[PDB]
Amino acid sequence: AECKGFGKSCVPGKNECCSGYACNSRDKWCKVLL
């Protein structure tokens, strides 16, 4: 088991995204935190 990278589809509210990223519920994906 490992985190999710950039451009991957994830669910908002869970803890799948890697460090520095953020599960954007907008498109249900990961993105580099501001």
From Swiss-Prot:
Q: What mutagenesis or variant effect is reported for V32W?
A: No gain of activity against hNav1.7/SCN9A
Its localization reads: Secreted
Here the disulfide bonds are C3-C18, C10-C23, C17-C30
> Where does the entry say this protein is expressed, by tissue?
Expressed by the venom gland.
Question: Leucine amide-modified residues are where?
Answer: L34
Subunit structure of this chain's protein: Monomer.
Could you give the domain comment from the record? The presence of a 'disulfide through disulfide knot' structurally defines this protein as a knottin.
| Additional observations | Negative results: has no effect on mammalian SCN3A/SCN1B (Nav1.3/beta-1), SCN4A (Nav1.4), SCN5A/SCN1B (Nav1.5/beta-1), and SCN9A/SCN1B (Nav1.7/beta-1). Has also no effect on sodium subtypes in rat DRG neurons containing Nav1.1/SCN1A, Nav1.6/SCN8A, Nav1.7/SCN9A, Nav1.8/SCN10A and Nav1.9/SCN11A. Klint et al., 2015 worked with a recombinant peptide N-terminally extended by an Ala residue (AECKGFGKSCVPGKNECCSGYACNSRDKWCKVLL).
Q: Which family does it belong to?
A: Belongs to the neurotoxin 10 (Hwtx-1) family. 14 (Hntx-1) subfamily.
**Protein's job:** Weakly blocks the rat SCN2A/SCN1B (Nav1.2/beta-1) sodium channel (IC(50)=68 uM) and the insect sodium channel para/tipE (IC(50)=4.3 uM), without altering the activation or inactivation kinetics (depressant toxin).
What's the protein called, per UniProt?
Answer: Mu-theraphotoxin-Hhn2b 3
Q: Which organism is it from?
A: Cyriopagopus hainanus (Chinese bird spider)
Full-sequence portion shown in this chain: 49 to 81 of 83
